[PDB]
Design an enzyme around this catalytic site. Sequence first.
Site, short mmCIF file in Angstrom:
data_model
loop_
_atom_site.label_atom_id
_atom_site.label_comp_id
_atom_site.label_asym_id
_atom_site.label_seq_id
_atom_site.Cartn_x
_atom_site.Cartn_y
_atom_site.Cartn_z
N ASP B 92 29.93 49.80 32.00
CA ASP B 92 28.51 49.55 31.71
C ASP B 92 28.07 50.53 30.62
OD1 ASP B 92 25.52 49.03 33.80
OD2 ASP B 92 25.92 48.52 31.73
N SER B 93 26.96 50.29 29.94
CA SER B 93 26.66 51.02 28.72
C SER B 93 25.77 52.26 28.91
CB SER B 93 25.97 50.09 27.74
OG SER B 93 24.88 49.46 28.42
N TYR B 96 21.42 51.08 32.48
CA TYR B 96 20.90 51.07 33.83
C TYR B 96 20.94 52.50 34.40
CZ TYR B 96 20.38 49.77 38.79
OH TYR B 96 19.97 49.67 40.10
N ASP B 127 21.47 48.46 26.41
CA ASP B 127 20.21 47.86 26.73
C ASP B 127 19.28 48.87 27.40
OD1 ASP B 127 21.80 47.91 29.16
OD2 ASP B 127 20.78 46.11 29.90
N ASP B 251 29.61 42.67 39.64
CA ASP B 251 29.96 44.01 40.09
C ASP B 251 28.92 44.48 41.11
OD1 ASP B 251 27.91 44.85 37.81
OD2 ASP B 251 28.23 46.59 39.10
N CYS B 289 40.54 38.07 58.38
CA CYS B 289 40.88 38.87 57.21
C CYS B 289 42.36 39.24 57.25
CB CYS B 289 39.96 40.09 57.16
SG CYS B 289 40.31 41.22 55.78
N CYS B 291 43.60 41.56 55.21
CA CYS B 291 43.87 42.92 54.70
C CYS B 291 44.69 43.73 55.68
CB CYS B 291 42.53 43.55 54.32
SG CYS B 291 41.78 44.60 55.58
N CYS B 294 42.95 45.22 58.76
CA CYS B 294 42.75 44.34 59.91
C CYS B 294 44.10 43.97 60.52
CB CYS B 294 41.97 43.08 59.53
SG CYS B 294 40.28 43.41 58.99
N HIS B 320 38.93 47.52 53.57
CA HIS B 320 38.57 46.26 54.18
C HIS B 320 37.47 45.55 53.40
CE1 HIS B 320 37.22 43.15 56.82
NE2 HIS B 320 35.98 43.62 56.69
C1 LIG Z 1 22.08 46.69 41.57
N1 LIG Z 1 21.30 45.96 40.60
C2 LIG Z 1 21.51 46.18 39.29
N2 LIG Z 1 22.53 46.76 38.71
C3 LIG Z 1 22.33 46.59 37.36
C4 LIG Z 1 23.07 47.12 36.29
C5 LIG Z 1 24.19 48.08 36.61
C6 LIG Z 1 25.41 47.25 37.00
N3 LIG Z 1 26.28 47.96 37.95
C7 LIG Z 1 27.10 49.03 37.30
C8 LIG Z 1 26.65 50.36 37.82
C9 LIG Z 1 27.20 50.86 39.00
C10 LIG Z 1 26.77 52.10 39.46
C11 LIG Z 1 25.81 52.83 38.76
C12 LIG Z 1 25.26 52.34 37.58
C13 LIG Z 1 25.70 51.10 37.12
C14 LIG Z 1 22.60 46.87 34.98
N4 LIG Z 1 23.21 47.49 33.86
C15 LIG Z 1 22.73 47.36 32.65
N5 LIG Z 1 23.40 47.84 31.54
N6 LIG Z 1 21.64 46.55 32.41
C16 LIG Z 1 21.00 45.83 33.41
O1 LIG Z 1 20.08 45.04 33.20
C17 LIG Z 1 21.47 46.06 34.78
C18 LIG Z 1 20.80 45.45 35.84
C19 LIG Z 1 21.23 45.79 37.12
N7 LIG Z 1 20.77 45.47 38.37
ZN LIG Z 2 40.21 43.35 56.73
#
Ligand SMILES: CNc1nc2c(CCNCc3ccccc3)c3nc(N)[nH]c(=O)c3cc2[nH]1
Ligand SMILES: [Zn+2]
Lengths: 354, 354
Positions: B92-93, B96, B127, B251, B289, B291, B294, B320
């Site tokens: 991811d960039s 978030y 973004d 994810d 399951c 896995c 289990c 699991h």
């Molecule tokens: C849970 N809901 C949610 N996740 C979003 C993410 C992060 C995706 N998950 C990767 C991550 C894992 C752990 C910590 C930080 C990121 C987004 N990433 C970006 N770039 N832009 C989004 O609009 C955006 C919207 C989101 N909504």
């Molecule tokens: Zn399992």
Amino acid sequence: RPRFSFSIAAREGKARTGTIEMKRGVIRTPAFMPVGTAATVKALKPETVRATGADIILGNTYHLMLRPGAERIAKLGGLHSFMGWDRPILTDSGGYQSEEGVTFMLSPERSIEIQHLLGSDIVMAFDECTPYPATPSRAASSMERSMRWAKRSRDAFDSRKEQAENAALFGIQQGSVFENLRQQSADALAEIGFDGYAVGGLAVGEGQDEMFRVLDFSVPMLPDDKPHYLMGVGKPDDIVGAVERGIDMFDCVLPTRSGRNGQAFTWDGPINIRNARFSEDLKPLDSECHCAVCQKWSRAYIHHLIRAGEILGAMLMTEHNIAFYQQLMQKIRDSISEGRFSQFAQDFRARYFA
Amino acid sequence: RPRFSFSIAAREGKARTGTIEMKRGVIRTPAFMPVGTAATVKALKPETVRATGADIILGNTYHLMLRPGAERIAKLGGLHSFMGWDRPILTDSGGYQSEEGVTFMLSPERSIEIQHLLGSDIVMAFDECTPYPATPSRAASSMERSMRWAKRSRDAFDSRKEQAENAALFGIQQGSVFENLRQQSADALAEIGFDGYAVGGLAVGEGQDEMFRVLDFSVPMLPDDKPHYLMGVGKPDDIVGAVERGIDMFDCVLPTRSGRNGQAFTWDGPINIRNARFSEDLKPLDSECHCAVCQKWSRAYIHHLIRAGEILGAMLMTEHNIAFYQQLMQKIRDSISEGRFSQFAQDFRARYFA
Ligand SMILES: CNc1nc2c(CCNCc3ccccc3)c3nc(N)[nH]c(=O)c3cc2[nH]1
Ligand SMILES: [Zn+2]
Ligand SMILES: CNc1nc2c(CCNCc3ccccc3)c3nc(N)[nH]c(=O)c3cc2[nH]1
Ligand SMILES: [Zn+2]
């Protein structure tokens, strides 16, 4: 396999190598037993424990009686089934206040009963582990109580047919650092008769020099034809010296606990992987180690994991340290069988302490 | 393999199944990507991640730039080598505050550069993820900024030959819950042109009904011939519904995080393994399951581990839950290929919510 058979295949000085045969498997000696207090060797699956070379692990009467409960584990099929380890398990007795036992309730009879409920293969007698330092009077009183408790342990074990027929019973020698008390204790235990004999009451603050001095006279007091177990020991150099003094079995929390704390054992000595000098070190933890951790991951990565508080850091450090300990025991076994253990002990030390 | 090729093998309604081919491997779609924020999927070795069926995992620009550092990971050979995962990684960039970027410093150019330094296979555009709720004006301003940043991302990626030649670039659609903004965003991204398109700004408090409503109109705005990635989603039923609306990639931290917290996913719904009703339950976590957890361990044991705070508890719960998610994706893929996904979706829901 028999209920219990100890065979000595080779000797060098006081050192011995051989095997303990039990119904759930063979134990190569000198043996290191990983500790698994809450029915888990912390941060490792049992298959991983086994992969590293362990033949037997240690469980605990005190901790399991409190959680999840001995009766509960028996209801669920016993400790082996519960935690997924099908090879031998040794259980400590909770010895590590009245003549009847200890309330906090543990007595010789309850202790032996809990070990039965857990389905332990090697049952330890319920003892009173004598604090250090101890005056001679107190060490004597405590040792005497333990011997009484030793007899009580023996009778309780023997009174339980399934236990007597499928498990083994080890006696624990007390006496602090006093030769005459150690001798009285050994005599008493030998008269009662056990399947193996532990040296209790060491590794409780006296230091290596004193520990080794006590071992010097104490281990030859034990029946030669039975295993000798040093409880709670220890660092790699403790282990080597204790084998040189006739010890066949060891348990210790060091490899697991200190692993989660960042301490990695190597043939060049322990290292603390969190130190900044490892942050860009692409070498594995130890240069010769055969474990899967050192096959695949760098010091740098593991440094990062431990600093970050990541569970994989504990996992990898622990797998490595237990593998390291098993490799140590293998090299000990091999060198005794080849009659070059004294040279191995010297080489080990020169490099470990360089 | 090519740098990037998405092929759709079968469809049912808006649902699609196929494969993404990349240099480091093939990704079966619809795909679930386990999250690995600190260069580890928490409590799992990469081989274990792979064993559960993952084809690709997710890494993070923000967390790794802070620790252990992007330059440092590049010096050590890149993220794949560092953490021991040789298959694709999506990063991811960090999305978030000014038009240049975000100081806390991250801009489109630095973001893309960090992903390069990590050696990411699927690079996300930098973004501005729009909080919920958002007024239309603010959602518009934020969406517009993201599209500008999208172009900047594209140009930075393209300016780096090794990156452009070996990795892929995904654009992220913003616009909150507003159809017209979603459409403007989709148009802008399509005009710039990307290898895949994510739906950003959902799963940020709006609820499933609203999320699904936005997906209903937003996903058909994206190029059909490219993958559709829903960021941050989600619960098993979120996933099923999103696939019914044309999503190919997911994810989420849920399976890992909630696993360490005692929550186990099952085909009968989630359970909290710490609840006293499991303390003597010899059944595995889930009855069907496949896995290894289990195969071998009881609810009772895992209940004990989690209650005791043992690391093996986190390990087993996490293995699991990730396996569960991969099995879910496999059943989704299979039913779409067989044209019975709508029936699968109905069956899943009836039983999951029974
Ligand atoms: C849970 N809901 C949610 N996740 C979003 C993410 C992060 C995706 N998950 C990767 C991550 C894992 C752990 C910590 C930080 C990121 C987004 N990433 C970006 N770039 N832009 C989004 O609009 C955006 C919207 C989101 N909504
Ligand atoms: Zn399992
Ligand atoms: C570290 N030094 C040390 N350990 C000793 C133990 C415990 C052995 N290790 C098993 C264990 C692991 C975790 C928690 C509790 C026990 C002893 N056990 C008994 N029964 N009697 C002893 O004399 C005695 C002496 C010890 N010295
Ligand atoms: Zn190693």
